[PDB]
Every structure is written in structure tokens, then in C-alpha cells.
Design an enzyme around this catalytic site. Structure first.
Site, PDB file in Angstrom:
ATOM      1  N   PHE A  53       8.010 -14.446  34.681  1.00  0.00           N
ATOM      2  CA  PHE A  53       6.732 -13.754  34.829  1.00  0.00           C
ATOM      3  C   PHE A  53       5.684 -14.373  33.908  1.00  0.00           C
ATOM      4  O   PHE A  53       6.019 -15.081  32.957  1.00  0.00           O
ATOM      5  CB  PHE A  53       6.878 -12.264  34.534  1.00  0.00           C
ATOM      6  CG  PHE A  53       7.210 -11.970  33.111  1.00  0.00           C
ATOM      7  CD1 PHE A  53       8.516 -12.075  32.651  1.00  0.00           C
ATOM      8  CD2 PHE A  53       6.215 -11.604  32.221  1.00  0.00           C
ATOM      9  CE1 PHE A  53       8.819 -11.812  31.318  1.00  0.00           C
ATOM     10  CE2 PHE A  53       6.510 -11.340  30.895  1.00  0.00           C
ATOM     11  CZ  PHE A  53       7.813 -11.443  30.443  1.00  0.00           C
ATOM     12  N   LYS A  56      -6.458 -12.351  36.474  1.00  0.00           N
ATOM     13  CA  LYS A  56      -6.086 -13.403  35.537  1.00  0.00           C
ATOM     14  C   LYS A  56      -4.828 -13.094  34.701  1.00  0.00           C
ATOM     15  O   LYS A  56      -4.101 -14.010  34.304  1.00  0.00           O
ATOM     16  CB  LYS A  56      -7.262 -13.694  34.589  1.00  0.00           C
ATOM     17  CG  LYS A  56      -8.419 -14.424  35.224  1.00  0.00           C
ATOM     18  CD  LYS A  56      -9.477 -14.797  34.201  1.00  0.00           C
ATOM     19  CE  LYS A  56      -9.015 -15.961  33.308  1.00  0.00           C
ATOM     20  NZ  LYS A  56     -10.107 -16.438  32.395  1.00  0.00           N
ATOM     21  N   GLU A  87      -7.290   1.096  38.456  1.00  0.00           N
ATOM     22  CA  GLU A  87      -5.869   1.322  38.228  1.00  0.00           C
ATOM     23  C   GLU A  87      -5.172  -0.036  38.213  1.00  0.00           C
ATOM     24  O   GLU A  87      -5.042  -0.669  39.255  1.00  0.00           O
ATOM     25  CB  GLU A  87      -5.294   2.210  39.347  1.00  0.00           C
ATOM     26  CG  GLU A  87      -3.769   2.287  39.392  1.00  0.00           C
ATOM     27  CD  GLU A  87      -3.178   2.833  38.098  1.00  0.00           C
ATOM     28  OE1 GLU A  87      -2.687   2.021  37.271  1.00  0.00           O
ATOM     29  OE2 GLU A  87      -3.208   4.081  37.921  1.00  0.00           O
ATOM     30  N   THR A 134       4.155 -14.794  42.413  1.00  0.00           N
ATOM     31  CA  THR A 134       4.051 -14.784  43.870  1.00  0.00           C
ATOM     32  C   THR A 134       2.788 -14.043  44.320  1.00  0.00           C
ATOM     33  O   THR A 134       2.154 -14.435  45.299  1.00  0.00           O
ATOM     34  CB  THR A 134       5.298 -14.174  44.529  1.00  0.00           C
ATOM     35  OG1 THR A 134       5.564 -12.882  43.978  1.00  0.00           O
ATOM     36  CG2 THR A 134       6.485 -15.084  44.289  1.00  0.00           C
ATOM     37  N   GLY A 169     -16.900 -24.627  30.637  1.00  0.00           N
ATOM     38  CA  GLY A 169     -16.876 -25.417  29.418  1.00  0.00           C
ATOM     39  C   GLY A 169     -15.617 -26.249  29.305  1.00  0.00           C
ATOM     40  O   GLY A 169     -15.613 -27.293  28.648  1.00  0.00           O
ATOM     41  N   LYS A 220     -18.767  -7.892  32.126  1.00  0.00           N
ATOM     42  CA  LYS A 220     -19.170  -9.249  32.483  1.00  0.00           C
ATOM     43  C   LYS A 220     -19.636  -9.338  33.934  1.00  0.00           C
ATOM     44  O   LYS A 220     -20.502 -10.142  34.265  1.00  0.00           O
ATOM     45  CB  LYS A 220     -18.038 -10.255  32.268  1.00  0.00           C
ATOM     46  CG  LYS A 220     -17.750 -10.611  30.828  1.00  0.00           C
ATOM     47  CD  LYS A 220     -16.748 -11.765  30.759  1.00  0.00           C
ATOM     48  CE  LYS A 220     -16.685 -12.378  29.356  1.00  0.00           C
ATOM     49  NZ  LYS A 220     -15.522 -11.980  28.550  1.00  0.00           N
ATOM     50  N   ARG A 239       0.272 -22.603  26.074  1.00  0.00           N
ATOM     51  CA  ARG A 239      -0.948 -21.793  25.997  1.00  0.00           C
ATOM     52  C   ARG A 239      -0.742 -20.536  25.165  1.00  0.00           C
ATOM     53  O   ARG A 239      -1.604 -20.153  24.363  1.00  0.00           O
ATOM     54  CB  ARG A 239      -1.446 -21.405  27.385  1.00  0.00           C
ATOM     55  CG  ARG A 239      -2.030 -22.553  28.188  1.00  0.00           C
ATOM     56  CD  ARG A 239      -3.476 -22.794  27.764  1.00  0.00           C
ATOM     57  NE  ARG A 239      -4.388 -21.846  28.403  1.00  0.00           N
ATOM     58  CZ  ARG A 239      -4.695 -21.824  29.698  1.00  0.00           C
ATOM     59  NH1 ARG A 239      -4.163 -22.706  30.534  1.00  0.00           N
ATOM     60  NH2 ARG A 239      -5.538 -20.906  30.158  1.00  0.00           N
ATOM     61  N   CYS A 249      -0.509  -1.210  29.935  1.00  0.00           N
ATOM     62  CA  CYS A 249      -1.665  -0.683  30.643  1.00  0.00           C
ATOM     63  C   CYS A 249      -2.890  -0.532  29.753  1.00  0.00           C
ATOM     64  O   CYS A 249      -4.014  -0.640  30.227  1.00  0.00           O
ATOM     65  CB  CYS A 249      -1.301   0.659  31.286  1.00  0.00           C
ATOM     66  SG  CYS A 249      -0.498   0.426  32.905  1.00  0.00           S
ATOM     67  N   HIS A 282       0.039   5.380  30.507  1.00  0.00           N
ATOM     68  CA  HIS A 282      -0.362   4.932  31.857  1.00  0.00           C
ATOM     69  C   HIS A 282      -1.883   4.829  32.020  1.00  0.00           C
ATOM     70  O   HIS A 282      -2.456   5.300  33.014  1.00  0.00           O
ATOM     71  CB  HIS A 282       0.185   5.876  32.934  1.00  0.00           C
ATOM     72  CG  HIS A 282       1.672   5.825  33.065  1.00  0.00           C
ATOM     73  ND1 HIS A 282       2.517   6.472  32.189  1.00  0.00           N
ATOM     74  CD2 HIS A 282       2.463   5.177  33.950  1.00  0.00           C
ATOM     75  CE1 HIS A 282       3.770   6.237  32.540  1.00  0.00           C
ATOM     76  NE2 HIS A 282       3.765   5.456  33.607  1.00  0.00           N
TER      77      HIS A 282
HETATM   78  O1  IHP Z   1      -7.082 -16.231  28.284  1.00  0.00           O
HETATM   79  P1  IHP Z   1      -7.881 -17.500  27.983  1.00  0.00           P
HETATM   80  O2  IHP Z   1      -7.421 -18.632  28.925  1.00  0.00           O
HETATM   81  O3  IHP Z   1      -7.494 -17.944  26.560  1.00  0.00           O
HETATM   82  O4  IHP Z   1      -9.478 -17.239  28.083  1.00  0.00           O
HETATM   83  C1  IHP Z   1     -10.184 -16.644  27.111  1.00  0.00           C
HETATM   84  C2  IHP Z   1     -10.410 -15.088  27.408  1.00  0.00           C
HETATM   85  O5  IHP Z   1     -10.441 -14.857  28.660  1.00  0.00           O
HETATM   86  P2  IHP Z   1      -9.523 -13.961  29.753  1.00  0.00           P
HETATM   87  O6  IHP Z   1      -9.393 -12.453  29.533  1.00  0.00           O
HETATM   88  O7  IHP Z   1     -10.481 -14.217  30.914  1.00  0.00           O
HETATM   89  O8  IHP Z   1      -8.141 -14.545  30.033  1.00  0.00           O
HETATM   90  C3  IHP Z   1     -11.761 -14.517  26.829  1.00  0.00           C
HETATM   91  O9  IHP Z   1     -12.412 -13.770  27.784  1.00  0.00           O
HETATM   92  P3  IHP Z   1     -12.323 -12.095  27.639  1.00  0.00           P
HETATM   93  O10 IHP Z   1     -10.832 -11.685  27.570  1.00  0.00           O
HETATM   94  O11 IHP Z   1     -12.930 -11.658  26.288  1.00  0.00           O
HETATM   95  O12 IHP Z   1     -13.023 -11.321  28.762  1.00  0.00           O
HETATM   96  C4  IHP Z   1     -12.754 -15.389  25.935  1.00  0.00           C
HETATM   97  O13 IHP Z   1     -13.949 -15.491  26.457  1.00  0.00           O
HETATM   98  P4  IHP Z   1     -15.467 -15.047  25.851  1.00  0.00           P
HETATM   99  O14 IHP Z   1     -16.181 -16.282  25.291  1.00  0.00           O
HETATM  100  O15 IHP Z   1     -16.324 -14.466  26.974  1.00  0.00           O
HETATM  101  O16 IHP Z   1     -15.429 -14.016  24.737  1.00  0.00           O
HETATM  102  C5  IHP Z   1     -12.068 -16.774  25.609  1.00  0.00           C
HETATM  103  O17 IHP Z   1     -12.922 -17.586  24.990  1.00  0.00           O
HETATM  104  P5  IHP Z   1     -13.208 -17.590  23.379  1.00  0.00           P
HETATM  105  O18 IHP Z   1     -11.918 -17.311  22.610  1.00  0.00           O
HETATM  106  O19 IHP Z   1     -13.778 -18.943  22.916  1.00  0.00           O
HETATM  107  O20 IHP Z   1     -14.239 -16.519  23.008  1.00  0.00           O
HETATM  108  C6  IHP Z   1     -11.395 -17.492  26.771  1.00  0.00           C
HETATM  109  O21 IHP Z   1     -12.182 -17.854  27.797  1.00  0.00           O
HETATM  110  P6  IHP Z   1     -12.333 -19.462  28.344  1.00  0.00           P
HETATM  111  O22 IHP Z   1     -11.238 -20.347  27.738  1.00  0.00           O
HETATM  112  O23 IHP Z   1     -12.190 -19.535  29.889  1.00  0.00           O
HETATM  113  O24 IHP Z   1     -13.683 -20.082  27.969  1.00  0.00           O
END
Ligand code: IHP
EC number: 2.3.1.-
Length: 309
Positions: free
Chosen positions: A288, A241, A122, A247, A268, A181, A5, A168, A103
């Protein structure tokens, strides 16, 4: 990058970095090296934060995100004609020197007709191993109060998602986007804060490093009135996330309320992914999750994408 990933995020960013020039190219290469397993990102992230904030405000109108160089300028923004809802990222300040010390945290703000409410997230811990973060948070609270903000309308939410303070800025930026969001849920917390209350605080505060210190010392150690709670009690799973700890993810999913145990990727996607599965997908080597380093690659890509198309 030992993590498929993460490697995909590396591969997606690489051509943009190759076509880029100047400071942002160097920033991209450093971030790539870091995700690959190769100096201080708090300073580097902070240097390029304005560019990412500018891009994200465009990608998501209404995000209303600002980078302030000190919480002093947050206070100034409370005294101006800006939007009723905005987000702010700022470093902490040393009370004795006025020096900003990284920080970073994220503040989610609502202005009200005609006494704002403020949620400070924080990503690490409120207190800090040498009680330094606590002193820095108290400075912010003190300044807010002296400017006329009742601290009963302020909350500091400790998530403990960040394992160090080196990332940070990235947690704070991610948190701003997540706050946007989940604006409806934040709206509800702000409504409570208008009445001087924070949901779950009676149990949640004790679960934070602040709560531990308060129970241990029987002293008031944070300025009176300000609220505090643990992230998982009052925020959506979104905020965990990029948690470093495998853990932590395991124990969060064990919580009876099930709030941390659902799907964390968008619908999706064919196969659903929960917090533990995500953490493992981004696991690198002592082990980690390097998920937050993946988020940094994503942000740089978003910036360079605007510059290159
Ligand atoms: O870390 P990923 O597994 O690659 O997920 C990401 C990421 O999400 P996370 O921060 O939640 O980890 C984005 O979300 P944001 O960081 O911008 O908040 C973004 O989503 P957006 O469509 O809302 O911009 C993206 O998708 P993409 O690169 O197509 O824009 C995709 O989310 P998903 O794979 O779950 O759809």
C-alpha cells in the site's frame, strides 16, 4: 523506509523531534516509527490536531480551519458571527451514548446572506461495513436539520481514499488544506447547493457505498434532501494523492474524463508525477501507499519548525 520519498520525510523530521520536548516529541517519534514500519493514531492525531490546525491557519491565512470535538459545535458555529467561509474537522458521534468515536471528516462551509451550504468530505466510506458510519452521518444531518439547515444545501462526498479509519484525522486535515487551495471549485459547488443541487449527483451517488445501499434496498437510508457523490466525480485529483490503494489510482487514471490522470505535484519539480507514480513512490510492505504517513511527518515538522525558529 523502503520508500526513498518517505525516508526523506523521515530524515527531515528527525532533528526536529530530537530537539523537541514533551507530548509533541512523543507524537513525532510515534509518527516516525509508523513511517519506518514499527499506537492508535486516530486518538494521537486527534490529541495534537489543535496544534497543527493553529499552524496551518497561520501558514495559509483564510484557511479558517477549526477542530470541533463534536458536530454539535459545528452547528453552534453556524449560529455565530464568524467568517463566511470556514473549514471544520470533527469526529463522529454515537447516537445512543453521545460518545465521540473518531472516524473524522472535514466540512467545508459557506455562510450566505443572510441558510449555509455545507460540503462534508468523507475520506473513507459513508455507510461502513457494519452500517455504523451511516448512522453517525445521519445523526449529523438530523442535528443540522433540527437547527434549521435545509439538508438540500448539504452534501456528503465519499472519496474512499482512506483504506482504514486509523488515519482519518490526517486525511481530514489534508482535505481542509486542499479545500482551501481549491476554494474556487468549492465555491462553485456551494453555489449549486444554494439551489439545492449537486453536480453529477444523478450518476455519482450510485457509485458510492450509500448509492449501493439505496439501490439494493429501495429504502431511504439517509435523511431526505442531503446530497452525496463519489469524490473523483466532483473533486480535484488533489483529494486522491494520499490514497492507500495502488489499484484505485490505476482505475481513477483510466476514467474517460481524464480528470484524475494529470500531474499531481507542483510545476516547480523538474519531472512531473501522476497519481500512479506517486502511489508507487510511497509504496511499502499486503502492499500500500504510505503517503498519508508522510503527510503526518510533514505536519509535525511544520509544527515543530514554528516552535524551533
Ligand atoms: O507530499 P509531497 O510530494 O511531499 O508534496 C508536498 C505537500 O503536498 P501534498 O499534500 O499535496 O502531498 C504540500 O502540500 P500540502 O499538503 O500542504 O497541501 C507542500 O506544499 P505547499 O508549498 O503548498 O505548502 C509541499 O511543499 P513544501 O514542503 O515545499 O511546502 C509539497 O508539495 P510539492 O512537492 O508538489 O511542491
Amino acid at each position: 523506509t523502503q520508500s526513498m520519498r518517505l525516508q526523506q520525510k523521515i530524515n527531515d523530521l528527525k532533528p526536529y523531534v530530537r530537539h523537541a520536548r514533551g507530548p509533541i516529541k512523543a507524537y513525532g517519534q510515534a509518527a516516525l516509527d509508523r513511517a519506518s514500519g514499527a499506537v492508535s493514531f486516530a486518538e494521537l492525531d486527534a490529541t495534537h490536531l489543535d496544534a497543527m490546525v493553529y499552524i496551518e491557519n497561520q501558514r495559509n491565512p483564510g484557511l479558517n480551519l477549526k477542530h470541533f470535538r463534536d458536530h454539535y459545535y459545528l452547528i453552534q458555529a453556524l449560529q455565530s458571527d464568524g467568517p463566511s467561509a470556514f473549514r471544520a474537522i470533527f469526529p463522529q458521534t454515537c447516537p445512543e451514548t453521545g460518545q465521540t468515536l473518531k472516524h473524522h471528516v472535514m466540512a467545508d462551509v459557506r455562510l450566505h446572506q443572510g441558510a449555509p451550504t455545507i460540503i462534508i468530505t468523507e475520506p473513507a466510506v459513508i455507510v461502513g461495513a457494519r452500517y455504523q458510519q451511516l448512522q453517525r452521518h445521519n445523526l449529523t444531518l438530523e442535528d443540522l436539520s433540527e437547527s434549521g439547515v435545509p439538508l438540500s444545501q448539504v452534501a456528503i462526498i465519499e472519496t474512499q481514499a482512506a483504506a482504514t479509519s486509523d488515519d482519518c484525522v490526517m486525511y481530514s486535515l489534508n482535505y481542509a488544506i486542499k479545500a482551501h487551495k481549491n476554494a474556487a471549485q468549492f465555491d462553485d459547488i456551494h453555489h449549486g447547493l444554494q439551489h439545492g443541487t449537486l453536480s453529477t449527483e444523478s450518476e455519482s451517488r450510485a457509485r458510492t457505498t450509500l448509492g449501493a445501499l439505496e439501490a439494493s434496498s429501495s429504502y431511504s437510508v439517509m435523511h431526505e434532501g442531503a446530497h452525496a457523490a463519489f469524490g473523483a466525480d466532483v473533486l480535484p485529483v488533489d483529494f486522491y494523492k494520499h490514497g492507500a490503494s495502488l489499484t484505485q489510482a490505476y482505475y481513477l487514471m483510466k476514467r474517460p474524463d481524464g480528470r484524475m490522470a494529470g500531474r499531481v505535484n507542483s510545476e516547480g519539480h523538474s519531472e512531473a508525477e501522476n497519481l500512479v507514480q506517486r502511489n508507487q513512490a510511497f509504496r511499502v510492505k499486503t502492499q500500500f501507499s504510505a503517503s498519508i504517513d508522510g503527510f503526518r511527518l510533514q505536519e509535525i515538522k511544520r509544527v515543530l519548525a514554528a516552535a524551533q525558529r
